Design a protein around this ligand. Structure first.
Ligand SMILES: O=C(Nc1cccc(CC(C(=O)O)C(=O)O)c1)c1ccc(C(=O)c2cccc(I)c2)s1
Length: 216
């Protein structure tokens, strides 16, 4: 159990309040820079049909969630490896030590690494323990990223709008079409309201988070 239970409480409360239909809306008053996320997914590559999912964190680290449900992570120095089993047990390595065991998986990771650097661009670049990708799925409209620190990210394909939900600080960071990185306290959104756009994706978020809960 990550903090999805209670992520759901935060969203149910925000949506039940209907921040879209509100007399005077001052979305700006709902912002709070003390809730700015440290980690989010900046790039991702779906290759589940074969290997699994590769992604890049905003800290320039790269991970891969394989079809066997193990995760390999390369740190920002390009040498340190962290490996997480199904069981969630961790162990640490370096590429340079050339471990026989992970040779096949290290190689696949490096492949994702290169693709991402060559063909993909940094989502939320302008902005100032390392988690892993616990689980993920995509709809026809979005891809849903569940990190091990409890945060859940939703990326909407059509217009490149992203949500980062942070259960701990009870927060949400919304990246709009103009690529503006605005962070809000979910509770303050109830009070001050928000625009129809954001209020609809918070709804979608809840449906998605609920979908994460019934698929453990
Ligand atoms: O570098 C590789 N492909 C590549 C190398 C040189 C030139 C091209 C042609 C190139 C192109 O047509 O622009 C492309 O398809 O990327 C392919 C690959 C590196 C990894 C590949 C994998 O087998 C791999 C395995 C797991 C995940 C991923 I992304 C890729 S192939």
């Amino acid at each position: 159990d990550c903090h999805l239970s209670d992520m759901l409480q935060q969203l149910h409360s925000v949506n039940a309040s209907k921040p879209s239909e509100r007399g005077l809306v001052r979305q700006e008053e709902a912002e709070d820079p003390a809730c700015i996320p440290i980690f989010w997914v900046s790039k991702w590559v779906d290759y589940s049909d074969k290997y699994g999912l590769g992604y890049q964190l905003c800290d320039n680290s790269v991970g891969v969630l394989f079809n066997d449900s193990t995760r390999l992570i390369l740190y920002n120095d390009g040498d340190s490896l962290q490996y997480i089993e199904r069981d969630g047990t961790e162990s640490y390595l370096t590429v340079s030590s050339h471990p026989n065991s992970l040779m096949k998986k290290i190689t696949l990771l490096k492949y994702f690494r290169n693709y991402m650097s060559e063909h993909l661009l940094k989502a939320g670049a302008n902005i100032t323990r390392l988690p892993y990708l616990r689980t993920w799925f995509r709809t026809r409209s979005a891809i849903i990223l569940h990190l091990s620190n409890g945060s859940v990210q939703i990326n909407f394909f059509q217009d490149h709008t992203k949500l980062i939900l942070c259960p701990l600080m009870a927060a949400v960071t919304y990246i709009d079409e103009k690529r503006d990185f605005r962070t809000y306290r979910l509770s303050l959104l109830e009070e001050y309201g928000c625009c129809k756009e954001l209020a609809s994706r918070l709804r979608y978020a809840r449906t998605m988070v609920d979908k994460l809960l019934s698929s453990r």
